[PDB]
DNA sequence: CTCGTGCCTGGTGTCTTGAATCC
DNA sequence: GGATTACACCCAAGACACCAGGCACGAG
RNA sequence: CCUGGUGUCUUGGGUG
């Protein structure tokens, strides 16, 4: 058995291509003298090929666009063969982490599994809004909080049993969502409970002004700053903001420019 | 929010032509919501700090993706003064 | 003064001792062990403990105090973590020196191949400089091609020594098994070399130019990586609510992911030829994390296609830490504009535009002789000249006079500071780039004037090599009593009339005035 | 304030001015060091007034320094590459 | 130990431009922090001016510690050094 | 020049930097031993005693 | 805060466990080494003080300073009021009163007699004066370092100490 | 355990204190700051010797701040206890967990598992005491204990004793 | 030192044997084979 | 009402072969 | 085989890809 | 009723 380096993600394609070549050449004068070929997911970027002569390995891969042209094949020891073909949990009452949907990343208890053996019913702390803005994603979801049936009663619900309600077509029993997930959609290994899981389980600014005394008499402006007695008017006419005393200003109101009786 | 004045914006979020503006005044008001009331964040555009003038014209349209799209052109007049450069 | 009071004694630095950080010491200063490459808890706010933004490493946010020192983000220096490596790897910087050490010592017990009995070698240990001594020793021992079990017993093991060669990040040693036969060069892994180095005696450690307390030779192999705090790798917001991570943050994630997969191998399905591909990849990421300009191999790339900014590249070149932030840097209290000439200014004056004079400031200490004068400036405020911008108490709290509506109710105490506007006869340092010689920086006396150019008396254009065709010049304002006196008594224009370059003046009567005086 | 302006102040001999420009008028920073091991490993809670270098088990021999922030940054980048820059405040010969 | 006795002082008896600048600045600084002034202050009230007045009358109460290359030093008072 | 190489080599051979150069002190922000920094200034306790007694520290 | 003549204590390759203070093993730490140096660099033996010496020096220093505070103008409760602050008042009063109830030779006449009698490691010489003993059997048990020295006089030491000792 | 130690203190002086009695101010300043204070390195500093004649040296002016730095070298009486040292004491309190004894400045705690069984706490007696027949431990009774451990708080140090050994106890 | 450096460099910035800047470069670079 | 197809969002992971002088 | 190649300053002009899985809508 | 944050990395075109 030789290993061969191939383009990442193209290992299954190379195994396929080798099979087509083998079957197409069976019984001809130039058979492909390989016995088998395979690719292990755990071993990214490699295909393994079974034969008697190295030349057959080169023959199997000739012209394959997914294989690195460098003469990189390597020999496997007989004592390493079976480990290449090693094929490899989940119990009711145990915890898993959800891998998809608004509950992605959340800890859940395994309640039960389907007869066929694919999806598992999970007990989950819900993330609900009680229909508050109706007329969901994992990035725009809700905080987790146990289902409250009286809140649902008040705001937006079918009773099914003691402590069991169907609310918006999902089932909540004693405050928890019970929802089926594909087993492939949950993580059962190396779960690390989090901290949180251990805990749980002046009236004239900006108004337009006219100046009635001084060298700037008759000009429009806006009150930029009115700290005290001395105002800052941003004059319109030249690009300058001036310091000015409060006796000098007329303010606009409902009827004309009004003195300091506004 | 920015430190400048917002009092020159109309209700459509856009300033109108004819209004004089000075530096750091907001001329286009825009917000972005904060992900998980009191939910948004300011994303407004202030006039460049060293400039002034008059808003001349405001284009409103949509872009290739269908969202709203604005342009604000400001005009001012530059008068020669000590330090300006000239050449034959 | 901008620093809150601390009872620890203030001292200056007299010596910098360089050396290596031992593995033990890295753990002793670390405040957290780093294991998980997922930065966020689960994208629901608050970053994950044990992750790369664990809050024990520090705060780069104005509203979260450091859970280690209690100080705000301004004072908090940041605290290091550590990352345990499943397998020891080489430090990319030290490989050529490691290679040199192999030819010096025995690859079984680690003893120096020569003794004081060799007369030339006894002369070489006397050389006082550690680097030259180490080289002189290696120059002798290089030709010694077998570690002798017996003196020419010395503690030797009798084995012949290999010729070690570097091939990228890997070292190959070719042993000559005992005319010509077949030699088998096997790879000299970091772990293999690591054990050999710990058995080197203290007496041979010194003779190799290393140092028992500060640079012990097995510390050139990396077993635990120090995790720098977030101050070294801050996040930036590209378009306000979207933030990307620093190149180091992404690269540390790659090392951390790669570290977990080395743990994932030794407990189950390892087809050996896979162990070598995964361990070499951990070596790769740790190498390009420190130096991504390794000759003879492709650079690590970001997904954008451009090369990763390694730590080595952070320090070198015009914009790096040393030439760009330490030998020179951007500074406060500076100004710049176009210059114009004025014959009706004294030689040592500079005309300063009013707008510039209201932005710059000098912190004048309040005393009995000027307290009445300084109160007048306070009433005028930041917008009327001559005025003032801040009042600074002995505790350091600044009162911003733009927003103080009860400015009339301030009474000044002796010892406070008032940051007043720049005013007539204050000395300032004036400067035009490129600063080719010392009279590119002379002290002038300010004269505040209308219009926006800097004014120079015409006879100083020559030492600056300035003219008025668009040139700009820089002005710097000293910020204390001590430096004002240094400017006026050492750098002032009249002291600079004669230059030491050619024992003659560098300023004279020029252009119109010189034409006219004839 | 570039490299060439630095040289001009040396030529003038204005050492005091050059120090102030590059510290008080810029990025001045206060750090704490351990008097034994010389590292910036001190954990300093100033309102509790308690200091400890955990490595040396030292709560008494501790100094404060005024250095540029960009120098503090430099030393932390060197630490991240396993280089130990030990700052001592006294000579020994 | 390092200190050199008064009778055996060898460095120049004139105040250098660098020593002068440091003395004026340091003394100026102390006056602005309300140190007792040793001369009469008339019309000239700037901190630098008062310090320059004290220098001209040989009344600045400071000592220069001039370090020699080996680390030894001669202490010279500003009262005894000749100022041009 | 050779900025990073110097520093790696300096670490591996435990170099001691005695901080007497101008450049050392400039980048650490300390008063450099040059010009106005080439000496220390001490307070003349002997000359202060010629002042009158009402100027005395309590 | 406050420091001494002894400095640096930079790191060494070999650690040391002769530092932990053990009066039995003559380990007084790095500050109380056998050979100290004063503020001029001169060599000097460690100054360990018996209860009798210490009572004279401290009381003399306080009354000479008290006289100096009075421009030049006995009981322990009066001597402790010279200090400044209630914190200082406490430690000084408690130290005199403690010495007032355990110092055998409470005057300088007897003390100088004990001084000449005692004036060989300097720490052991000071220990023998502080701890009263009757016989040779009692001294080498409570102070087990006097075992293997083979130089008694011990008995005549204790006899003179007990004879100079006034009744009570 | 009493010693004489040559110590020094860095003193920073504000420029407004630069008058003709500067040294006398510093002498008062040194005493106020040092007398009665404790450190783990030296112990309790009881009294400073020759306070009115201390030579303070010359003050270094700090560049950039104007303040002056004095190194005041001095000589003091210091008190530090030591592990292994046998000492006498005066009992301050008696409790079910042992007793507290004032040895000059500080207090030493001896716990119950290191006290011999025949010494029985007797509250009914007037006044309360640890009693035997020819032994009498009331407040002020000379007792002989041995310091078996020193703990340091750098502000006040704490030492634990024992009377679980030969010849130690009341006399 | 610095005064010497500037005094020599500044004239060079404004300036059959080799002369001028190429000759100056040979000296500082103490080339073994001059032109 | 159920099934199939298309579109959108989220997560994970690279690769057909194609400027000149000095030490 | 790399490292070296003036200084400072202004301003305008830009941004991951592919595959797989899940959900929703439309048609039979 | 004091505090108060708006990006980076390049490339290109310019000024002395
Ligand atoms: Mg020009
Ligand atoms: Zn912190
Ligand atoms: Zn060997
Ligand atoms: Zn330490």
Ligand nearest to the CA of C155: 3
The size of the B-C interface in CB pairs under 8 A is 20
The Cα–Cα gap between F25 and D12 comes to 17
The nucleotide lying nearest C434 (C-alpha to C1') is K7
The answer to whether the CB atoms of C367 and E21 lie below 8 A apart is no
**CB proximity B35 to C under 8 Å:** yes
d(CA C113, CA C98): 16
State how far the Cα of C395 lies from the Cα of C73, in Å rounded to an integer: 20
Read off the tokens for D5. Answer: 């302006």
DSSP state of C472: E
Write the residues followed by a gap in chain D (C–N more than 2.5 A). none
Cβ neighbours around A47 below 10 Å, total: 29
Question: Which residues lie below 8 Å from residue H101, measured CB to CB, with a gap of 6+?
Answer: H89, H90, H91, H92, H107, H108, H110, H143, H145, H161
* CB < 8 Å & 24+ apart, contacts of H31-35: H31/G84, H32/G84, H32/G85, H33/H9, H34/G2, H34/H7, H34/H9, H34/H76, H35/G83, H35/G84, H35/G88, H35/G92
CB atoms within 10 A of CB C283: 22
Sign of torsion over alpha carbons C7, C11, C13, C18: negative
Round to whole Å and give the CA distance between A210 and A259: 10
Query: How would you class G34 by CB atoms within 10 Å of its CB: exposed for 0-12, middle for 13-18, buried for 19 or more?
Result: exposed
Phi and psi (nearest 5°) for G139? -80, -45
Q: Which residues of C touch I2 (CB under 8 A)?
A: 438
Dihedral pair phi/psi, residue C450, rounded to 5°: -70, 170
How many independent structural domains does chain D possess? 1
Q: How far is CA H72 from CA F51, G85, I7, in A?
A: 23, 22, 48
Structure tokens at C364: 């004048």
DSSP result, A112-138: EE-SSSSEEEEEE-----TTTT----S
Helix and strand totals (H; E) in chain D: 3, 5
Range of the domain at E34: 1-84
Pick left, alpha or beta for residue B54 (phi over 0 → left; psi -120 to 50 → alpha; otherwise beta): beta
What is the dihedral sign for C-alpha H58, H63, H66, H69? negative
Per the CB < 8 A criterion, the answer to whether C102 and C197 are in contact is no
d(CA C398, CA H43): 43
Q: State the DSSP string of B59-73.
A: EEEE-TTSSEEEEEE
Sign for the CA dihedral angle at D87, D93, E1, E5 comes to negative
Determine contact, residues D23/D66, Cβ cutoff 8 Å.
yes
Subunits with 3+ C-beta pairs closer than 8 A to C: A, B, D, E, F, G, H, I
Kindly report the CATH number assigned to the domain that includes residue E23: 3.90.940.10
Exposure letters A67-80 (e unless 16+ CB within 10 A, then b):
beeeeebeebeeee
3-state secondary structure of C428: strand
CA distance C363 to C372: 16
Chain D nearest C-alpha distance from F50 (Å):
31
From chain F, which residues contact D within 8 Å (Cβ)? 7-8, 11, 18, 22, 26-38
The DSSP bridge pattern shows strands C388-392 and F16-17 to be: unpaired
- For residues C101 and C140, the answer to whether their CB atoms sit within 8 Å is no
Q: Tell if the CB–CB gap between H64 and C482 is shorter than 8 Å.
A: yes
In whole angstroms, give the CA distance from residue C343 to residue C456: 8
For E27-36, give one letter per residue: b (16+ CB within 10 A) or e: bbbbbbbbbb
Q: Which residue in chain D has the smallest CA separation from E17?
A: D13
Cβ of C213 less than 7 A from strand L: no
Look up the protein residue whose alpha carbon has the minimum distance to the C1' of J16: A65
Q: Is the peptide bond before C434 cis (omega within 30 degrees of 0)?
A: yes
- DSSP class of residue E64 equals E
Residues in chain G after which the chain is broken, C→N over 2.5 Å: 73, 119
| Ligand 4: centre distance to CA C79 (Å) | 14
What does the DSSP 8-state code read for residue C300?
Answer: P
Closest CA to C15 of F9, G6, D58, F20: F20
Which domains does chain H show, CATH number per domain?
A: 1-82 (3.30.1490.120), 83-171 (2.40.50.140)
List the CATH number of the domain containing D19: 3.90.1800.10
Report cis status (omega within 30 of 0) of the bond before H127: yes
Looking at beta carbons, which pairs linking G68-73 to residues 24 or more positions away fall under 8 Å? G68/H52
Q: Which of G95, C471, C473 is nearest to H103 (CA)?
A: G95
- The reply to whether D8 sits in an annotated binding site is no
As given in the structure block, the two tokens for residue G2 are 């406050």
**Other Cβ atoms within 10 Å of C68 Cβ, number:** 19
- The answer to whether residues H150 and H103 touch, using CB atoms and an 8 Å cutoff, is no
Q: Scanning the structure block, which residue is given the tokens 């004649």?
A: H53
CA-based angle B59:B60:B62, to the nearest 5? 130
Tokens, residue C296: 């003879």
Cβ neighbour number for residue G40 with a 10 Å cutoff:
10
Q: Determination method here?
A: cryo-EM
Q: Which of A102, A145, A205, A234 to mutate to test the interface with B (most CBs of B within 10 A)?
A: A234
Q: How far apart are CA A108 and CA A99, in angstroms?
A: 11
Cα(C199) to centroid(ligand 4), Å: 27
Q: How far apart are CA H166 and CA H148, in angstroms?
A: 14
Give the Cα separation of C497 and C329 in Å (integer): 30
Hey, which residues 8-37 in chain D have their CB within 8 Å of chain H? 16, 19-20, 24
Which uninterrupted H or E stretch holds C335? strand C334-341
- G3 alpha carbon to ligand 4 midpoint, in Å? 18
Which residues, in sequence order, are bridge partners of residue C40?
A: C47
Q: Distance between CA D17 and CA I35 in Å, rounded?
A: 45
CA angle in degrees (0–180, nearest 5) for H13-H19-H24: 75
- How many angstroms does the Cα of residue C67 sit away from the middle of ligand 2? 7
Using a 10 angstrom Cβ sphere, with 0-12 exposed, 13-18 middle and 19 or more buried, the burial of residue I7 is middle
The gap between A65 CA and J16 C1' (Å) is 9
CA-nearest residue to E48 within chain C is: C485
Distance CA C413, CA C367 (A): 8
Ligand 2 ion: Cβ-proximal residues, 5 Å cutoff: C 66, 68-69, 76
Residues in Cβ contact with B22 at an 8 Å cutoff, skipping those fewer than 6 apart:
A224, A234, A239, A241, B47, B52
Cβ proximity of H76 and H4 under 8 Å: yes
Query: Strands, E, within chain H: which ranges?
Result: 2-13, 38-39, 43-49, 60-61, 68-79, 86-95, 98-103, 106-111, 120-122, 129-131, 136-137, 143-152, 157-162, 169-170
Q: Which of residues 49-78 of H touch F (CB under 8 A)?
A: 56, 58-61, 63-64, 68
Q: CA C255 to CA C347: how far, in whole Å?
A: 64
Which domains are assigned to chain G? 1-48 (no CATH), 49-168 (1.20.1250.40)
Parent domain of D40: 1-81
Å from B68 (CA) to L9 (C1')?
A: 29
Rounded distance between C-alpha atoms, residue H110 and residue A181, angstroms? 65
Distance separating alpha carbons of residues I3 and C501, to the nearest angstrom: 8
Is residue C274 less than 8 Å (CB to CB) from chain A? yes
What's the Å distance between residue A120 CA and nucleotide J2 C1'?
Answer: 23
Closest to C310 in 3D by CA, of C333, C293, C331: C293
Residue pair D89/D63 in contact by the 8 Å Cβ criterion:
yes
CATH of the domain at F13: 1.10.150.390
Give the ranges where C303-367 is alpha helix by DSSP (H).
311-315, 321-325, 354-359
User: Are H22 and F53 in contact (CB < 8 Å)?
Assistant: no
Q: Can you say whether the dihedral through the CA atoms of D66, D69, D70, D75 is positive or negative?
A: positive
Residues with CB under 7 A from strand K: A 100-101, 182, 185; C 238, 293, 295-296, 303-304, 318, 328, 330, 336, 433-434; D 2-4; F 1-2
How far apart (Å, rounded) are the C-alpha atoms in residues D65 and C10?
Answer: 6
The answer, yes or no, to whether H and A have at least 3 beta-carbon pairs within 8 Å is: no
| Chain I partners within 8 Å of D10 (Cβ) | 2
CB contacts, 8 Å: C275 with chain A: none
K19 nearest neighbour residue (CA to C1'):
A9
Query: Under 8 Å CB-to-CB from F3, ≥6 apart: which residues?
Result: C315, C316, C320, C322, C323
Strand L within 7 A of B24 CB? no
Strand pairing partners for D33? Answer: D63
Q: What is the DSSP string of A40-56?
A: -TTSTTEEEEEESSHHH
Q: How far is it, in rounded angstroms, from Cα A153 to Cα C34?
A: 47
The token pair at B65 is 């993706």
Q: Do F42 and H59 touch (CB under 8 A)?
A: yes
Pairing status of strand C454-456 against strand C334-341: parallel
Q: Give B50→chain C minimum CA distance, Å.
A: 12
d(CA F3, CA F25): 18
DSSP per-residue string spanning chain A:
-EEEEB-TT-HHHHHHHHHHHHHHHTTSSS---EEEEE--TTSTTEEEEEESSHHHHHHHHTT-TTB-SS--EEEPPGGGHHHHT------TT-EEEE-SSTTTT-EEEEEEE-SSSSEEEEEE-----TTTT----SSS--------HHHHHHH--EEEETTEEEETTEEEETTEEEEEEEGGGEE-SS----HHHHHH--TTTTSEEEE-SSTTTT-EEEEEEEEESEEEEEESSSS-EEEEEGGGEEEE-SSSEE-TT-
CA distance C444 to C447: 9
The H-assigned helical ranges of H2-154 are 22-34
Q: Please state the φ and ψ torsions of residue G127, each to the nearest 5 degrees.
A: -65, -50
Distance of alpha carbon G131 from alpha carbon H144, whole angstroms: 10
Output the six-digit token pair for F25: 């002190």
Strand L lies under 7 A from the Cβ of residue C8: no
Rg (CA), chain C: 33
Alpha carbon distances (Å) from C505 to C430, C502, D7, E78: 19, 8, 21, 33
**C436 touching chain I per CB within 8 A:** yes
Parallel, antiparallel, or unpaired for β E62-67 and H2-13? unpaired
Judge whether residue C237 contacts strand L, using its CB and a 7 Å cut-off.
Answer: yes
How far apart (Å, rounded) are the C-alpha atoms in residues C110 and C117? 19
Task: State both tokens at H86.
Answer: 């046998």
Collapsing DSSP to helix, strand or coil, C333 comes out as coil
Give how far Cα H143 sits from Cα of E30, G103, H104, Å. 59, 15, 14
Tell me the pairing of strands H143-152 and A34-38: unpaired
Chain C CB within 8 Å of residue F36 CB: yes
CB atoms < 10 A from the CB of C217, how many?
24
In terms of CA atoms, which chain C residue is nearest residue E17? C490
Q: CA–CA separation, A145 vs A125, rounded Å?
A: 6
Q: Looking at the complex, does the CB of residue F10 fall below 8 Å from at least one CB of chain C?
A: yes
C-alpha distance from residue E69 to each of E66, H49, I3, I5 (Å)? 10, 38, 21, 23
* Cα radius of gyration (chain D): 16
CA distance G153 to chain H (A): 22
Q: Where are the alpha helices (DSSP H) in C326-436?
A: 354-359, 371-380
B42: closest CA among B1, B85, B87, B13?
B1
Q: Please, is F9 exposed, middle or buried when counting C-beta atoms within 10 Å of its C-beta (0-12, 13-18, 19+)?
A: middle
Substitution target in I2, I5, I9 with the highest count of D β-carbons within 10 Å is I2
| Contact status, residue E47 vs residue E32, Cβ threshold 8 Å | yes
Q: Give how many domains chain E has, as a whole number.
A: 1
CA–C1' distance C128–K9 (Å)?
50
Q: Round and report the angstrom distance from CA (B4) to C1' (L5).
A: 14
Helix (H, G, I), strand (E, B) or coil at H84: coil
Strands H129-131 and H143-152: unpaired
In DSSP terms, H48 is beta-bridged to: H76
Tokens of H39: 């450190």
Cis peptide preceding A226, ω within 30 of 0: no
* Distance (Å, whole) CA C142 – CA C146: 10
Which ligand ends up closest to the CA of C72?
2
Q: Name the nearest CA neighbour of C228 among C89, C51, C70, C78.
A: C78
Break chain G down into helix, strand, coil percent, rounded to 5. 50, 10, 45
Residue D91 forms part of a structural domain: no
Q: What's the domain range around F30?
A: 1-37
Match 């396929």 to its residue by tokens.
Answer: A16
Say if D57 falls within a structural domain: yes
CB C33 within 8 A of CB C82: yes
């Amino acid at each position: 058995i030789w290993g061969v380096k191939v383009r990442l993600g193209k290992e299954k394609d190379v195994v396929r291509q080798i099979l087509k070549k083998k079957l197409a050449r069976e019984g001809t004068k130039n058979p492909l003298e390989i016995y088998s070929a395979f690719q292990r997911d755990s071993f990214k970027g490699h295909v393994y090929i079974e034969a008697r002569k190295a030349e057959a390995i080169n023959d199997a891969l000739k012209g394959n666009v997914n294989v690195f042209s460098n003469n990189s094949k390597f020999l496997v020891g007989i004592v390493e063969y079976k480990d290449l073909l090693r094929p490899v949990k989940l119990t009711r009452g145990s915890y898993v982490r959800v891998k998809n949907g608004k509950f992605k990343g959340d800890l859940a208890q395994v309640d039960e599994v389907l007869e066929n053996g694919l999806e598992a019913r999970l007990k989950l702390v819900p993330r609900l809004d009680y229909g508050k803005d109706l007329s969901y994603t994992s990035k725009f979801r809700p905080a987790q909080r146990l289902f409250s049936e009286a809140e649902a009663r008040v705001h937006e619900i079918r009773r099914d049993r003691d402590g069991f309600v169907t609310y918006g077509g999902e089932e909540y029993y004693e405050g928890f969502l019970y929802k089926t997930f594909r087993l492939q959609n949950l993580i059962v290994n190396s779960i690390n409970p989090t901290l949180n899981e251990l805990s749980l389980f002046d009236p004239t600014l900006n108004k337009t002004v006219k100046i009635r005394q001084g060298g700037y008499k008759g000009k429009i402006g806006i009150v930029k700053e009115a700290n005290g007695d001395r105002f800052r008017v941003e004059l319109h006419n030249p690009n300058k903001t001036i310091p000015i005393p409060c006796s000098f200003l007329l303010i606009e109101s409902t009827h004309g420019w009004v003195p300091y009786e506004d | 929010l920015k430190h400048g004045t917002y009092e020159k914006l109309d209700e459509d979020g856009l300033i109108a032509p004819g209004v004089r503006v000075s530096g750091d005044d907001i001329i286009i008001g825009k917000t972005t919501p904060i992900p998980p009331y009191h939910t948004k964040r300011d994303a407004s555009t202030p006039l460049r700090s060293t400039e002034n003038g008059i808003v001349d014209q405001v284009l409103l349209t949509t872009n290739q993706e269908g969202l709203k799209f604005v342009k604000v052109r400001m005009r001012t007049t530059k008068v020669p003064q000590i330090g300006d450069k000239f050449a034959s | 003064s901008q620093f809150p009071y601390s009872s620890a004694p203030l001292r200056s630095v007299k010596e910098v001792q360089f050396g290596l950080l031992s593995p033990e010491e890295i753990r002793a200063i670390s405040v957290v062990k780093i294991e998980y490459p997922e930065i966020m808890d689960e994208s629901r706010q608050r970053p994950r403990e044990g992750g790369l933004n664990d809050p024990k490493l520090g705060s780069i946010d104005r509203n979260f105090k450091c859970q280690t020192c209690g100080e705000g983000m301004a004072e908090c220096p940041g605290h290091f973590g550590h990352m345990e490596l499943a397998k020891p790897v080489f430090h990319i910087g030290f490989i050529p020196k490691i290679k040199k050490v192999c030819e010096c010592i025995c690859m079984n017990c680690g003893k120096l191949l020569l003794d004081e009995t060799n007369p030339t070698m006894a002369q070489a240990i006397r050389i006082r400089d550690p680097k030259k001594r180490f080289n002189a020793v290696w120059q002798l021992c290089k030709t010694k091609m077998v570690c002798e079990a017996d003196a020419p017993s010395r503690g030797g093991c009798g084995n012949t020594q290999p010729v070690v060669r570097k091939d990228g990040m890997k070292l190959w040693g070719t042993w000559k098994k005992s005319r010509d036969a077949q030699p088998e060069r096997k790879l000299l892994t970091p772990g293999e070399i690591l054990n050999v180095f710990k058995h080197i005696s203290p007496e041979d450690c010194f003779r190799l130019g290393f140092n028992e307390d500060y640079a012990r030779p097995e510390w050139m192999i990396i077993t635990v990586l120090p995790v720098p705090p977030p101050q070294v790798r801050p996040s930036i917001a590209m378009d306000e609510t979207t933030q990307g991570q620093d190149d180091l943050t992404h690269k540390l994630s790659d090392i951390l992911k790669a570290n977990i997969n080395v743990q994932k191998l030794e407990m189950d399905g390892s087809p050996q030829h896979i162990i070598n591909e995964v361990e070499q990849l951990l070596q790769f990421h740790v190498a390009t994390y420190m130096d991504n300009d390794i000759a003879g191999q492709p650079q690590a790339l970001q997904k954008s296609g451009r090369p990763v900014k390694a730590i080595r590249a952070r320090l070198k070149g015009k914009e790096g830490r040393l030439r760009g932030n330490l030998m020179g840097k951007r500074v406060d209290f500076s100004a710049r504009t176009v210059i114009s000439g004025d014959p009706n200014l004294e030689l040592d004056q500079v005309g300063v535009p009013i707008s510039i004079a209201k932005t710059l400031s000098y912190p004048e200490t309040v005393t009995q002789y000027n307290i009445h004068r300084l109160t007048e400036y306070v009433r005028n405020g930041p917008n009327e000249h001559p005025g003032a911008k801040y009042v600074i108490r002995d505790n350091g709290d600044r009162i911003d006079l733009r927003y103080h509506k009860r400015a009339g109710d301030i009474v000044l105490q002796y010892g406070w500071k008032v940051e007043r506007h720049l005013m007539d006869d204050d000395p300032v340092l004036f400067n035009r780039q490129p600063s080719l010689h010392k009279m590119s920086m002379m002290a002038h006396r300010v004269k505040v004037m209308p219009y926006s150019t800097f004014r120079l008396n015409l006879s100083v254009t020559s030492p600056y090599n300035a003219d008025f065709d668009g040139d700009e010049m820089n002005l710097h304002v000293p910020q204390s009593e001590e430096t004002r006196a240094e400017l006026s008594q050492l750098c002032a224009v009249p002291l600079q009339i004669v230059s030491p370059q050619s024992n003659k003046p560098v300023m004279g009567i020029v252009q119109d005035t010189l034409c006219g005086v004839r | 304030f570039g490299e060439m302006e630095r040289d001009c102040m040396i030529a003038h001999g204005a050492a005091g001015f050059l120090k102030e420009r590059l510290m008080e008028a810029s990025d001045a920073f206060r750090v704490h060091v351990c008097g034994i091991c010389g590292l910036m490993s001190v954990i300093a809670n100033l309102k509790k007034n308690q200091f400890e270098c955990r490595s040396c088990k030292n709560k008494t021999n501790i100094y404060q320094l005024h250095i540029p922030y960009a120098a503090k940054l430099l030393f932390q980048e060197l630490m991240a590459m396993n280089i130990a820059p030990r700052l001592y405040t006294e000579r020994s010969g | 130990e390092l200190a050199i006795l008064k009778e055996e002082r060898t460095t120049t008896p004139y105040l250098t431009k660098y020593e002068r600048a440091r003395i004026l600045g340091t003394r100026a600084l102390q006056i602005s922090m309300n140190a007792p002034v040793l001369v009469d202050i008339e019309g000239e009230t700037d901190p630098l001016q008062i310090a320059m007045k004290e220098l001209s009358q040989r009344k600045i109460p400071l000592v220069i510690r001039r370090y020699l290359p080996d680390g030894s030093y001669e202490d010279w008072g500003c009262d005894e050094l000749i100022v041009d | 020049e050779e900025t990073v190489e110097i520093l790696f080599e300096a670490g591996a051979a435990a170099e001691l930097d005695d901080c007497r150069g101008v450049s050392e002190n400039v980048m650490l922000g300390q008063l450099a031993p040059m010009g106005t920094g080439a000496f220390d200034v001490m307070i003349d306790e002997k000359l202060l005693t010629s002042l009158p007694a009402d100027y005395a520290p309590t | 805060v406050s420091t001494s003549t002894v400095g640096a204590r930079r790191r060494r390759a070999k650690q040391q466990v002769d530092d932990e203070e053990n009066a039995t093993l003559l380990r007084l730490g790095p500050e109380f080494a056998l050979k100290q140096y004063d503020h001029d660099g001169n060599e000097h033996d460690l100054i360990a003080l018996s209860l009798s010496e210490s009572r004279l020096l401290i009381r003399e220093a306080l009354k000479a300073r008290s006289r100096a505070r009075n421009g030049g103008v006995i009981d322990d409760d009066e001597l402790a009021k010279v200090t400044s602050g209630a914190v200082a008042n406490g430690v000084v009063k408690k130290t005199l009163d403690y010495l007032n109830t355990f110092a055998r030779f409470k005057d300088e006449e007897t003390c100088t007699a004990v001084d000449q009698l005692l004036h060989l490691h300097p720490f052991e010489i000071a220990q023998l004066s502080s701890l009263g003993c009757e016989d040779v059997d009692e001294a080498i048990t409570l102070i087990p370092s006097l075992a293997a020295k083979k130089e008694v006089n011990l008995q005549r030491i204790l006899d003179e100490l007990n004879r100079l000792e006034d009744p009570y | 355990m009493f010693f004489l130690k040559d110590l020094s203190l860095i003193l920073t002086l504000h420029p407004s204190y630069f008058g003709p009695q500067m040294n006398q101010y510093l002498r008062e300043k040194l005493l106020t700051d040092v007398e009665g204070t404790c450190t783990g390195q030296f112990g309790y500093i009881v009294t400073v010797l020759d306070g009115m004649n201390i030579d303070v040296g010359k003050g270094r002016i700090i560049p950039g701040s104007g303040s002056a730095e004095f190194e005041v070298k001095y000589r003091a009486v210091v008190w530090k206890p030591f592990k292994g040292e046998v000492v006498d004491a005066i009992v301050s309190n008696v409790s079910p967990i042992g007793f507290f004894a004032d040895v000059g400045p500080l207090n030493v705690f001896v716990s119950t598992r290191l006290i011999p069984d025949n010494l029985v706490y007797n509250p009914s007696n007037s006044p309360p005491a640890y009693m035997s027949n020819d032994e009498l431990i009331t407040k002020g009774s000379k007792v002989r204990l041995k310091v078996v451990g020193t703990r340091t708080d750098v502000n006040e140090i704490y030492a634990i004793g024992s009377i679980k050994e030969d010849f130690l106890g009341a006399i | 030192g610095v005064i010497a450096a500037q005094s020599i460099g500044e004239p060079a910035t404004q300036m059959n044997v080799t002369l001028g800047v190429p000759r100056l470069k040979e000296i500082l670079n103490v080339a073994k084979n001059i032109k």
